[PDB]
Amino acid sequence: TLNGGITDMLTELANFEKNVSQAIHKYNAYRKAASVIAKYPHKIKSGAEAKKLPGVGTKIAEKIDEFLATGKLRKLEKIRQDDTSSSINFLTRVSGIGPSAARKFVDEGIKTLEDLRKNEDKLNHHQRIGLKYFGDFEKRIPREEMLQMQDIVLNEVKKVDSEYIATVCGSFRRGAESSGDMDVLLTHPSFTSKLLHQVVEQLQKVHFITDTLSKGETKFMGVCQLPSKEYPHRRIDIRLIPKDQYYCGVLYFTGSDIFNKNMRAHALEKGFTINEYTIRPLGVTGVAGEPLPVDSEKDIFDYIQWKYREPKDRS
DNA sequence: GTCGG
DNA sequence: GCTGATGCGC
DNA sequence: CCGACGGCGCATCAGC
Ligand SMILES: *CC[C@H](OP(*)(=O)O)[C@H](O)COP(=O)(O)O
Ligand code: NA
Ligand code: NA
Ligand code: NA
Ligand code: NA
């Protein structure tokens, strides 16, 4: 919008770092720079101005000056026209193809979705499924559809055992109007520090779950589809969490990221440490004590004298 | 790439 | 066969 | 100057 050229430039740079250079820390630096500039409510006039924002340093400032002066970045123009770099970058759009698989494919002349179709022998299961649903997996999921999906999974987990607790988390639980995927956290009173299998099996039985990317005892990653134009196929994760770790898990997997940083910060200065699993009292010498009993995500907040924030208000 | 000890 | 490392997604 | 930057759960690879 105001700085869309800058934010587009930093996201392209991020993708190049992640996918081609395999520099995950440069990827995360450009993304951080991109999101603080996305939030700046003025049209940036100089790199010097942008540098004042946290996450923008000397190099992104220089890049912004080149972009504003010339309307482009020489290096990105060059990366963009590079056949090998552009193809490596592009293949990572397939779920299961990371930077390592995308380079391997481009090294053996496999550059396009069309090339992948004709070399399905050289793809693993995840990559094949990623290829099958390439377009569906880049579609966002309207909230209305997420509610129908939630309807089915809460109905079917209650059918296999009414003692299961299932919470859909992620952007969905923060009231977001569209979602990347569906992340379901499941727990059962029998589980504390075959329960997942029976839920996945029931969801396949009623043809909600259509494919499996990965499954073990505590994490399912797969594909689902709303019953019927056919709805797109969607990514669903299901995490089975110890009941005594559940509400910490729900808080962790709801976010947002910046919200949980600020929540970690507070708990620290109040003599408590929160992670994904437990909240723990902090001794006078900084030694974590025993995990504190947690019965609701409100409990966690109570332990650290914060006022409950509604998932709606946590973005 | 940016931050901070 | 196994154990540990690596790739991957989130 | 230089190390941190999230790290878990699963699939598959590398080595024994
Ligand atoms: C944006 C400029 C780069 O910052 P980073 O340490 O990735 C470098 O200064 C120039 O190197 P290159 O763009 O990676 O060749
Ligand atoms: Na800055
Ligand atoms: Na990918
Ligand atoms: Na690569
Ligand atoms: Na859907």
Short mmCIF file of C-alpha atoms (C1' of nucleotides) and ligand atoms in Angstrom, two decimals:
data_model
loop_
_atom_site.label_atom_id
_atom_site.label_comp_id
_atom_site.label_asym_id
_atom_site.label_seq_id
_atom_site.Cartn_x
_atom_site.Cartn_y
_atom_site.Cartn_z
CA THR A 1 0.00 0.00 0.00
CA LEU A 2 2.13 2.94 1.42
CA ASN A 3 5.44 0.99 1.23
CA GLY A 4 4.31 -2.05 -0.88
CA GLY A 5 7.35 -1.84 -3.22
CA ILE A 6 9.73 -1.96 -0.20
CA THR A 7 7.78 -4.77 1.60
CA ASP A 8 7.52 -6.80 -1.71
CA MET A 9 11.32 -6.31 -2.25
CA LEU A 10 12.18 -7.52 1.30
CA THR A 11 9.85 -10.57 0.97
CA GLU A 12 11.44 -11.54 -2.39
CA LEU A 13 14.93 -11.14 -0.79
CA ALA A 14 13.76 -13.28 2.20
CA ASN A 15 12.53 -16.07 -0.13
CA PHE A 16 15.83 -16.00 -2.10
CA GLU A 17 17.85 -16.31 1.17
CA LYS A 18 15.66 -19.18 2.49
CA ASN A 19 15.28 -21.22 -0.74
CA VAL A 20 18.54 -20.55 -2.73
CA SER A 21 21.29 -19.36 -0.27
CA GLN A 22 19.82 -21.58 2.59
CA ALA A 23 20.37 -18.73 5.08
CA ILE A 24 17.31 -19.17 7.35
CA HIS A 25 18.53 -16.30 9.62
CA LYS A 26 18.70 -13.81 6.71
CA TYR A 27 15.20 -15.01 5.57
CA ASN A 28 13.88 -14.29 9.13
CA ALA A 29 15.69 -10.86 9.22
CA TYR A 30 14.13 -9.72 5.87
CA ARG A 31 10.63 -10.96 7.03
CA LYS A 32 10.96 -9.07 10.36
CA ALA A 33 12.05 -5.93 8.40
CA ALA A 34 9.12 -6.51 5.93
CA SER A 35 6.42 -6.78 8.70
CA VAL A 36 7.61 -3.69 10.77
CA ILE A 37 7.60 -1.64 7.49
CA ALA A 38 4.14 -3.16 6.57
CA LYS A 39 2.92 -1.63 9.95
CA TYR A 40 4.59 1.86 9.53
CA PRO A 41 1.69 4.32 8.96
CA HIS A 42 3.75 6.76 6.74
CA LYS A 43 5.28 6.53 3.20
CA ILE A 44 9.01 5.94 3.84
CA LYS A 45 11.05 8.72 2.11
CA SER A 46 14.59 7.43 2.96
CA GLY A 47 16.53 4.43 4.27
CA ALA A 48 17.56 6.67 7.19
CA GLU A 49 13.84 6.94 8.17
CA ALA A 50 13.32 3.17 7.90
CA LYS A 51 16.55 2.44 9.89
CA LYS A 52 14.80 4.05 12.93
CA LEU A 53 12.41 0.98 12.98
CA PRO A 54 13.51 -2.14 14.94
CA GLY A 55 14.70 -4.87 12.52
CA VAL A 56 15.85 -2.40 9.83
CA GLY A 57 19.63 -1.92 9.78
CA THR A 58 22.36 -0.36 7.62
CA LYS A 59 21.99 -2.85 4.70
CA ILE A 60 18.14 -2.69 4.34
CA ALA A 61 18.45 1.14 4.65
CA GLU A 62 20.91 1.12 1.67
CA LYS A 63 18.51 -1.13 -0.24
CA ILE A 64 15.59 1.16 0.44
CA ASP A 65 17.63 4.19 -0.89
CA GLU A 66 18.40 2.18 -4.13
CA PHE A 67 14.69 1.15 -4.48
CA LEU A 68 13.39 4.76 -3.93
CA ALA A 69 16.06 6.34 -6.28
CA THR A 70 15.84 3.72 -9.10
CA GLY A 71 12.51 1.86 -8.57
CA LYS A 72 14.55 -1.38 -8.40
CA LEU A 73 17.33 -3.41 -6.75
CA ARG A 74 20.11 -4.50 -9.19
CA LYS A 75 20.78 -7.75 -7.25
CA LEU A 76 17.07 -8.78 -7.15
CA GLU A 77 16.64 -7.98 -10.89
CA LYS A 78 19.62 -10.33 -11.49
CA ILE A 79 18.40 -13.12 -9.09
CA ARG A 80 14.91 -12.82 -10.76
CA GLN A 81 16.26 -13.51 -14.33
CA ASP A 82 18.56 -16.34 -13.04
CA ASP A 83 17.12 -19.61 -14.42
CA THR A 84 18.52 -21.90 -11.64
CA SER A 85 17.71 -19.49 -8.75
CA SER A 86 14.13 -18.74 -9.98
CA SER A 87 13.39 -22.51 -10.44
CA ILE A 88 14.86 -23.52 -7.01
CA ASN A 89 12.81 -20.74 -5.37
CA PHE A 90 9.66 -21.89 -7.27
CA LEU A 91 9.88 -25.70 -6.49
CA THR A 92 9.90 -24.87 -2.69
CA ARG A 93 6.25 -23.81 -3.18
CA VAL A 94 5.46 -27.59 -3.25
CA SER A 95 4.78 -28.89 0.33
CA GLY A 96 7.61 -31.33 1.22
CA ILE A 97 10.15 -29.67 -1.23
CA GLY A 98 12.49 -27.54 0.91
CA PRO A 99 15.65 -25.76 -0.32
CA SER A 100 17.66 -29.04 -0.29
CA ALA A 101 15.14 -31.08 -2.43
CA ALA A 102 14.53 -28.04 -4.77
CA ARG A 103 18.35 -27.72 -5.51
CA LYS A 104 18.64 -31.54 -6.05
CA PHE A 105 15.78 -31.40 -8.60
CA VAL A 106 17.13 -28.29 -10.39
CA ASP A 107 20.65 -29.98 -10.46
CA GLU A 108 19.11 -32.94 -12.44
CA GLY A 109 17.08 -30.68 -14.82
CA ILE A 110 13.75 -30.94 -12.86
CA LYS A 111 12.59 -27.23 -12.77
CA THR A 112 8.74 -27.05 -13.22
CA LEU A 113 5.57 -28.77 -11.84
CA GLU A 114 5.42 -30.46 -15.28
CA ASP A 115 8.96 -31.89 -14.73
CA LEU A 116 7.88 -33.17 -11.26
CA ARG A 117 4.78 -35.00 -12.73
CA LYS A 118 7.02 -36.97 -15.12
CA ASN A 119 9.58 -37.84 -12.34
CA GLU A 120 7.12 -38.99 -9.59
CA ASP A 121 9.53 -41.92 -8.83
CA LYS A 122 11.99 -39.29 -7.38
CA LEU A 123 9.41 -37.67 -5.02
CA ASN A 124 8.64 -38.96 -1.48
CA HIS A 125 4.97 -39.34 -0.32
CA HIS A 126 4.64 -35.79 1.18
CA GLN A 127 6.14 -34.22 -2.01
CA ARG A 128 3.74 -36.27 -4.24
CA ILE A 129 0.74 -35.04 -2.16
CA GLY A 130 2.21 -31.51 -2.18
CA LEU A 131 2.34 -31.71 -6.01
CA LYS A 132 -1.21 -33.20 -6.25
CA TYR A 133 -2.72 -30.24 -4.32
CA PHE A 134 -0.26 -27.49 -5.40
CA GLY A 135 -2.99 -24.91 -6.14
CA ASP A 136 -5.37 -25.87 -3.28
CA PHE A 137 -2.50 -25.58 -0.71
CA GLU A 138 -1.83 -21.92 -1.74
CA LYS A 139 -5.54 -21.00 -1.26
CA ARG A 140 -6.65 -19.28 1.99
CA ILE A 141 -9.66 -20.86 3.81
CA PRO A 142 -12.63 -18.49 4.38
CA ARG A 143 -13.71 -18.36 8.09
CA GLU A 144 -17.21 -19.65 7.10
CA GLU A 145 -15.48 -22.81 5.74
CA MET A 146 -13.28 -23.12 8.87
CA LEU A 147 -16.54 -23.16 10.96
CA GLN A 148 -17.98 -26.05 8.85
CA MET A 149 -14.61 -27.84 9.21
CA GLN A 150 -14.61 -27.23 13.01
CA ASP A 151 -18.23 -28.52 13.07
CA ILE A 152 -17.12 -31.90 11.54
CA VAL A 153 -13.97 -32.38 13.64
CA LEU A 154 -15.60 -31.48 17.03
CA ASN A 155 -18.65 -33.72 16.11
CA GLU A 156 -16.43 -36.76 15.06
CA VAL A 157 -13.93 -36.52 17.98
CA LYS A 158 -16.98 -36.46 20.44
CA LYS A 159 -18.32 -39.57 18.54
CA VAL A 160 -15.16 -41.65 19.21
CA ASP A 161 -14.97 -40.46 22.89
CA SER A 162 -17.05 -37.75 24.64
CA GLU A 163 -14.09 -37.26 27.11
CA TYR A 164 -11.80 -35.94 24.30
CA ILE A 165 -11.21 -32.14 24.37
CA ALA A 166 -10.48 -30.59 20.92
CA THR A 167 -9.62 -26.93 20.34
CA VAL A 168 -9.02 -25.42 16.90
CA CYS A 169 -6.17 -22.86 17.45
CA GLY A 170 -4.09 -20.65 15.07
CA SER A 171 -5.44 -17.55 13.22
CA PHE A 172 -8.90 -19.20 13.41
CA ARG A 173 -9.04 -18.97 17.25
CA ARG A 174 -7.87 -15.26 17.09
CA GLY A 175 -11.10 -14.62 15.05
CA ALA A 176 -9.14 -14.19 11.77
CA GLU A 177 -11.48 -13.92 8.69
CA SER A 178 -9.36 -16.51 6.76
CA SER A 179 -6.82 -19.24 7.72
CA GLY A 180 -3.71 -20.89 6.16
CA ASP A 181 -4.69 -24.31 7.56
CA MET A 182 -6.55 -25.98 10.48
CA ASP A 183 -4.49 -26.78 13.63
CA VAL A 184 -6.48 -29.01 16.11
CA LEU A 185 -5.07 -29.65 19.60
CA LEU A 186 -6.51 -32.80 21.15
CA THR A 187 -6.17 -34.20 24.69
CA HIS A 188 -7.85 -36.97 26.73
CA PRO A 189 -7.90 -37.49 30.55
CA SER A 190 -6.17 -40.90 29.97
CA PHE A 191 -3.12 -38.98 28.47
CA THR A 192 -0.59 -37.08 30.71
CA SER A 193 3.27 -36.77 30.99
CA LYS A 194 -3.68 -45.27 20.14
CA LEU A 195 -5.59 -42.04 21.14
CA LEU A 196 -4.60 -40.03 18.00
CA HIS A 197 -5.05 -43.00 15.59
CA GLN A 198 -8.78 -43.52 16.55
CA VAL A 199 -9.59 -39.78 15.84
CA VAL A 200 -7.71 -39.78 12.44
CA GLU A 201 -9.40 -43.10 11.57
CA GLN A 202 -12.92 -41.68 12.34
CA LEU A 203 -12.18 -38.50 10.27
CA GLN A 204 -11.10 -40.75 7.32
CA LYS A 205 -14.17 -43.01 7.83
CA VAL A 206 -16.54 -40.02 7.07
CA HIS A 207 -14.20 -38.93 4.18
CA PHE A 208 -13.14 -35.65 5.87
CA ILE A 209 -9.43 -36.61 5.93
CA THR A 210 -8.42 -37.52 2.32
CA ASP A 211 -4.60 -37.89 2.60
CA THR A 212 -1.78 -38.36 5.14
CA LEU A 213 1.54 -36.37 4.95
CA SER A 214 2.92 -37.74 8.27
CA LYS A 215 1.42 -39.50 11.34
CA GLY A 216 2.87 -40.67 14.68
CA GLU A 217 1.55 -41.01 18.25
CA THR A 218 1.22 -37.23 18.94
CA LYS A 219 1.14 -35.36 15.53
CA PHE A 220 -0.93 -35.97 12.41
CA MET A 221 -0.29 -33.83 9.31
CA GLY A 222 -2.64 -34.38 6.39
CA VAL A 223 -5.29 -33.19 4.02
CA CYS A 224 -9.04 -32.77 4.38
CA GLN A 225 -12.02 -31.63 2.29
CA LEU A 226 -15.55 -30.30 3.12
CA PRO A 227 -18.37 -32.31 1.49
CA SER A 228 -20.03 -30.83 -1.66
CA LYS A 229 -18.07 -27.38 -7.31
CA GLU A 230 -15.75 -29.47 -5.02
CA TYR A 231 -14.30 -27.47 -2.05
CA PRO A 232 -10.48 -27.11 -2.25
CA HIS A 233 -8.35 -29.64 -0.30
CA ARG A 234 -7.01 -28.08 2.95
CA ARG A 235 -4.07 -28.77 5.29
CA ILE A 236 -5.09 -30.05 8.75
CA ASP A 237 -2.69 -30.79 11.64
CA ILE A 238 -3.82 -32.68 14.78
CA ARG A 239 -1.66 -32.52 17.93
CA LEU A 240 -2.37 -34.89 20.90
CA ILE A 241 -1.10 -33.08 24.06
CA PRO A 242 -0.84 -34.35 27.66
CA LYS A 243 -3.93 -33.05 29.56
CA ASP A 244 -1.54 -31.51 32.19
CA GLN A 245 0.21 -29.64 29.29
CA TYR A 246 -3.02 -28.88 27.31
CA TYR A 247 -3.96 -25.25 28.14
CA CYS A 248 -0.28 -24.15 27.85
CA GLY A 249 -0.32 -25.87 24.39
CA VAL A 250 -3.58 -24.05 23.41
CA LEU A 251 -2.06 -20.69 24.46
CA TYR A 252 1.22 -21.46 22.59
CA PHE A 253 -0.55 -22.61 19.33
CA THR A 254 -3.05 -19.68 19.36
CA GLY A 255 -0.41 -16.87 19.41
CA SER A 256 0.17 -14.53 17.80
CA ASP A 257 4.04 -14.70 17.98
CA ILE A 258 4.46 -11.07 19.15
CA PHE A 259 1.61 -11.65 21.69
CA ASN A 260 3.42 -14.74 23.19
CA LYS A 261 6.81 -12.85 23.33
CA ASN A 262 5.09 -10.09 25.46
CA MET A 263 3.39 -12.81 27.62
CA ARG A 264 6.80 -14.58 28.16
CA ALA A 265 8.36 -11.16 29.01
CA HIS A 266 5.73 -10.42 31.75
CA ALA A 267 5.85 -13.92 33.38
CA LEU A 268 9.71 -13.59 33.64
CA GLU A 269 9.64 -10.29 35.63
CA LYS A 270 6.96 -11.93 37.94
CA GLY A 271 9.27 -14.90 38.82
CA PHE A 272 7.62 -17.39 36.36
CA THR A 273 8.74 -19.10 33.09
CA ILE A 274 6.11 -20.03 30.41
CA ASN A 275 6.99 -22.26 27.40
CA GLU A 276 4.82 -24.45 25.06
CA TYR A 277 4.30 -27.14 27.86
CA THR A 278 4.33 -25.71 31.43
CA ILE A 279 4.44 -22.56 33.63
CA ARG A 280 7.09 -22.86 36.40
CA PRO A 281 8.01 -20.68 39.43
CA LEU A 282 11.47 -19.00 39.22
CA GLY A 283 13.66 -19.19 42.40
CA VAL A 284 15.66 -16.22 43.79
CA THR A 285 18.75 -17.64 41.87
CA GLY A 286 16.83 -18.25 38.55
CA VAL A 287 16.27 -22.05 38.98
CA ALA A 288 12.95 -23.31 37.45
CA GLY A 289 10.79 -25.11 40.07
CA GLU A 290 8.10 -27.80 39.48
CA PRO A 291 5.42 -27.37 36.74
CA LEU A 292 2.34 -25.53 38.25
CA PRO A 293 -1.12 -27.20 37.76
CA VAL A 294 -3.05 -25.55 34.81
CA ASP A 295 -6.81 -26.27 34.28
CA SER A 296 -7.70 -23.50 31.77
CA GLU A 297 -5.63 -20.98 29.76
CA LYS A 298 -7.09 -18.26 32.12
CA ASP A 299 -5.21 -20.03 35.00
CA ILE A 300 -1.86 -19.26 33.20
CA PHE A 301 -2.71 -15.49 33.07
CA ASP A 302 -3.85 -15.59 36.77
CA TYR A 303 -0.42 -17.01 37.86
CA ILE A 304 1.28 -13.82 36.40
CA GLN A 305 -1.31 -11.09 37.40
CA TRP A 306 -2.28 -10.26 33.75
CA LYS A 307 -5.94 -9.58 32.72
CA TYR A 308 -7.32 -12.38 30.42
CA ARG A 309 -6.96 -11.32 26.74
CA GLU A 310 -9.66 -12.78 24.40
CA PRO A 311 -8.21 -14.77 21.44
CA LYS A 312 -10.03 -12.12 19.25
CA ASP A 313 -7.78 -9.36 20.76
CA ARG A 314 -4.37 -11.22 20.61
CA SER A 315 -3.32 -10.28 16.98
"C1'" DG B 1 20.80 -9.20 8.30
"C1'" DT B 2 20.01 -7.23 12.84
"C1'" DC B 3 20.54 -7.13 17.55
"C1'" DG B 4 22.96 -6.89 21.79
"C1'" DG B 5 26.53 -8.84 25.35
"C1'" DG C 1 18.92 -54.26 12.04
"C1'" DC C 2 20.12 -49.99 15.00
"C1'" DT C 3 21.20 -45.05 16.16
"C1'" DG C 4 21.81 -40.28 15.23
"C1'" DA C 5 21.65 -36.52 11.66
"C1'" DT C 6 19.23 -34.02 8.47
"C1'" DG C 7 15.20 -32.05 5.99
"C1'" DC C 8 10.81 -30.28 6.50
"C1'" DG C 9 6.66 -27.83 8.14
"C1'" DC C 10 4.71 -25.02 11.33
"C1'" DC D 1 33.79 -8.88 17.45
"C1'" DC D 2 30.71 -12.59 17.40
"C1'" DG D 3 26.81 -15.79 18.78
"C1'" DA D 4 21.66 -15.90 18.92
"C1'" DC D 5 18.13 -15.97 16.05
"C1'" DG D 6 12.34 -21.82 18.27
"C1'" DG D 7 12.68 -26.22 18.24
"C1'" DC D 8 9.60 -30.27 18.19
"C1'" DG D 9 7.59 -34.52 15.74
"C1'" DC D 10 7.91 -37.41 11.84
"C1'" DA D 11 10.08 -39.31 7.41
"C1'" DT D 12 14.07 -40.41 5.35
"C1'" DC D 13 18.97 -40.57 4.83
"C1'" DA D 14 23.92 -41.79 6.36
"C1'" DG D 15 26.67 -44.67 8.77
"C1'" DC D 16 27.63 -48.58 11.55
C1 LIG E 1 21.68 -6.59 1.43
C2 LIG E 1 23.20 -6.55 1.36
C3 LIG E 1 23.81 -7.84 1.84
O1 LIG E 1 23.45 -7.88 3.22
P1 LIG E 1 23.62 -9.37 3.92
O2 LIG E 1 24.98 -9.52 5.03
O3 LIG E 1 22.77 -10.69 3.10
C4 LIG E 1 25.35 -7.89 1.67
O4 LIG E 1 25.96 -6.69 2.13
C5 LIG E 1 25.89 -7.98 0.25
O5 LIG E 1 26.08 -9.36 -0.11
P2 LIG E 1 25.12 -10.19 -1.13
O6 LIG E 1 24.00 -9.25 -1.51
O7 LIG E 1 24.72 -11.39 -0.29
O8 LIG E 1 26.01 -10.55 -2.32
NA NA E 2 16.78 -0.09 13.08
NA NA E 3 7.97 -26.44 0.35
NA NA E 4 18.61 -24.64 -2.18
NA NA E 5 -12.38 -25.60 3.44
#
